[PDB]
Design a protein around this ligand. Structure first.
Ligand SMILES: OC[C@H]1O[C@@H](O[C@H]2[C@H](O)[C@@H](O)[C@H](O)O[C@@H]2CO)[C@H](O)[C@@H](O)[C@@H]1O
Ligand SMILES: OC[C@H]1O[C@@H](O)[C@H](O)[C@@H](O)[C@@H]1O
Length: 445
C-alpha cells in the first residue's frame, strides 16, 4: 500500500512564455500588453519587468535537462503570440515559430510530452490597440493566431489548451485593474469574459482541423474552493455570489450554455454582449477540462468588494507567502463537483503549487519543507479523487522554476527549482528532489 497512480498518469511542471522566456526584443518579437503594463507605476510590487526573467529563450535546453532530472513525462508551456504574429495578424515571424519548433523537438527527444497553452495573457500590444478583449473582433484575431501555430506544430503537439484562466484575463485585466491592460470597469470585464469564452469555442474546430485523430483540446479554468464564513443567511448568499463569480461564471457557459442566472441579474444582464448562436459556439465539445487550483476562499457579507458585497475572512490555518490558505481537501472538492455536475471525459490539474520564502543554504541547497508539505497534501487529494472514479489524467506543478509572478514581480517564488537571478543558476529545491522520486515511483511512498 504505497498509494500508487494509474499506469499512464502524466506528471509535469508548468510555465508561461512571458514569465520565463525573456529575450523580449529578440528575433522579431513585438511588445505584449505586459511589456507595456510593467512600465506603469504601482503595477508590479518590486518594480520589475519580464524583460530577462529566466532567459529560458536562450536556456531552454538546460531547463529541459532539469525536467529529465525531475522525471516528468509532460511539460506545460505557453506560446507567445508576439513572437508568432508580431503585428498581431498577417505576416508570420518564422524565427518565432522556429523557437517553438526547437523547444518541442527537444522535449520529444527527451521523452517529454508537450502540452501547449495558446493564450497565457501576452497579447501583442499592437493587437490590443485594435481589439481589446472587450471588443468582439478579438475573437477572429485569436483564431487566426491559433490557425497559424497549430498548422506548424500539430504533427508534434497533440495536447492543446486554448486560454489560461478566463477569470484572470477578464476580471484582473479589465475589472480590477491588477493585470494588463489594467482597466477597472464592470462592463468591460463582462464583455472580456464573454469574448474569452467565444475565442475558446471558435478556436476548438480550428485546432481539430489542423491536427489528426489523436489531437486533444480544452480550456484552463482557475477554480478555488469557496466557503461561507458562518451559517447566517447573508454569509451563505455572499459565498454563493462569489462562487458564481469565480467558479461558475465560465463552467456554466462551457457545459450548460448559460451564465449563472442570479449573478447575471445582479450585474445587469444587458452588459454581457451575447449574440445569437454564441452559446452553441461556447459549448463546442472538449476532450478535457483543465483546472488551476491553489486555495480555499472564505467569504462573508460586507462591502470590502462593493461590486459583489462580500468581505474575505482568513480561517485559522496555514498560509503561503501569497497569503493563500493551504486547503488540499479543496482540490478533491473541486474535482468532485466538476465530475458530478459536468462529467468531463478527462480532467487535468494544469497548475497547483505554493510560494514560500526560499534561501540558498551554506551548502548550496534550498530547504523548502512547507512547499513540499503543500504539494504532498495536494497530491494526496488527487489520489483520493482518482480512487473515487474521477478521471484525473495528470498533474502539473506550478512551477518548474521561480519566475516573474505578474503583479508580485520576482519576489514570489513558486518553483520546485530555485533561480539565482544574478547568475541564472538553477538549483533543484528539496521539494523538487522529492518530486523527482514521486514521478519515478508514479506515486507517494
Ligand atoms: O482569490 C481571490 C484573489 O485572486 C487573486 O488572483 C489569483 C487567483 O486566486 C488564482 O485562482 C489564479 O490562478 O491566479 C490569480 C493571479 O495570481 C487576485 O490576485 C486577488 O486580487 C484576489 O483577491
Ligand atoms: O499565481 C500563481 C499562478 O496562478 C495562475 O493564475 C497562472 O496561470 C500563473 O501564471 C500564476 O503565476
Amino acid at each position: 500500500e504505497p498509494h500508487r497512480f494509474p499506469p499512464d498518469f502524466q506528471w509535469g511542471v508548468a510555465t508561461s512564455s512571458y514569465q520565463i522566456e525573456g529575450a523580449v526584443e529578440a528575433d522579431g518579437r513585438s511588445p505584449s500588453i505586459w511589456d507595456t503594463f510593467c512600465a506603469r507605476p504601482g503595477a508590479i510590487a518590486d518594480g520589475s519587468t519580464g524583460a530577462i526573467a529566466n532567459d529560458h529563450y536562450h536556456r531552454y535546453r538546460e531547463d529541459i535537462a532539469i525536467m529529465k532530472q525531475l522525471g516528468v513525462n509532460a511539460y506545460r508551456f505557453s506560446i507567445a503570440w508576439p513572437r508568432i504574429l508580431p503585428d498581431g495578424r498577417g505576416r508570420v515571424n518564422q524565427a518565432g515559430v522556429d523557437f517553438y519548433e526547437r523547444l518541442v523537438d527537444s522535449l520529444l527527444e527527451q521523452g517529454i510530452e508537450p502540452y501547449a497553452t495558446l493564450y497565457h495573457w501576452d497579447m501583442p500590444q499592437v493587437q490590443h490597440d485594435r481589439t481589446p478583449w472587450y471588443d468582439r473582433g478579438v475573437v477572429d484575431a485569436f483564431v487566426e493566431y491559433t490557425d497559424v501555430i497549430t498548422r506548424r506544430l500539430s504533427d508534434r503537439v497533440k495536447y492543446w489548451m486554448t486560454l489560461n484562466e478566463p477569470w484572470v484575463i477578464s476580471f484582473l485585466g479589465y475589472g480590477a485593474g491588477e493585470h494588463a491592460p489594467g482597466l477597472r470597469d464592470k462592463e468591460l470585464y463582462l464583455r472580456a469574459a464573454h469574448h474569452v469564452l467565444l475565442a475558446h469555442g471558435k478556436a476548438m474546430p480550428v485546432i481539430r482541423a489542423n491536427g489528426n485523430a489523436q489531437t486533444k483540446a480544452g480550456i484552463v479554468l482557475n477554480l478555488n474552493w469557496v466557503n461561507a464564513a458562518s451559517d447566517s443567511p447573508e454569509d451563505q448568499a455572499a459565498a454563493r455570489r462569489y462562487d458564481q463569480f469565480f467558479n461558475r461564471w465560465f463552467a456554466e457557459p462551457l457545459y450548460n450554455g448559460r451564465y449563472p442566472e442570479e449573478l447575471l441579474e445582479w450585474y445587469g444582464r444587458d452588459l454581457v454582449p451575447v449574440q445569437p448562436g454564441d452559446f452553441d459556439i461556447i459549448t463546442t465539445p472538449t476532450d478535457f477540462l483543465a483546472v488551476n487550483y491553489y486555495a480555499r476562499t472564505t467569504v462573508k457579507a460586507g462591502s470590502t468588494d462593493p461590486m459583489l458585497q462580500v468581505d474575505f475572512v482568513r480561517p485559522p490555518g496555514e498560509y503561503t507567502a501569497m497569503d493563500w490558505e493551504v486547503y488540499p481537501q479543496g482540490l478533491y472538492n473541486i474535482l468532485n463537483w466538476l465530475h458530478t455536475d459536468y462529467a468531463p471525459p478527462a480532467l487535468y490539474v494544469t497548475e497547483n503549487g505554493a510560494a514560500y520564502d526560499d534561501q540558498v543554504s551554506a551548502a548550496g541547497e534550498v530547504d523548502d519543507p512547507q512547499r513540499l508539505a503543500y504539494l504532498e497534501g495536494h497530491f494526496e487529494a488527487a489520489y483520493r479523487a482518482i480512487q473515487a472514479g474521477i478521471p484525473l489524467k495528470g498533474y502539473f506543478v506550478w512551477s518548474l522554476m521561480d519566475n516573474f509572478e505578474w503583479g508580485r514581480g520576482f519576489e514570489k517564488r513558486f518553483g520546485i527549482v530555485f533561480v539565482d537571478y544574478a547568475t541564472q543558476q538553477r538549483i533543484i529545491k528539496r521539494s523538487g528532489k522529492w518530486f523527482s522520486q514521486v514521478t519515478r515511483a508514479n506515486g507517494l511512498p
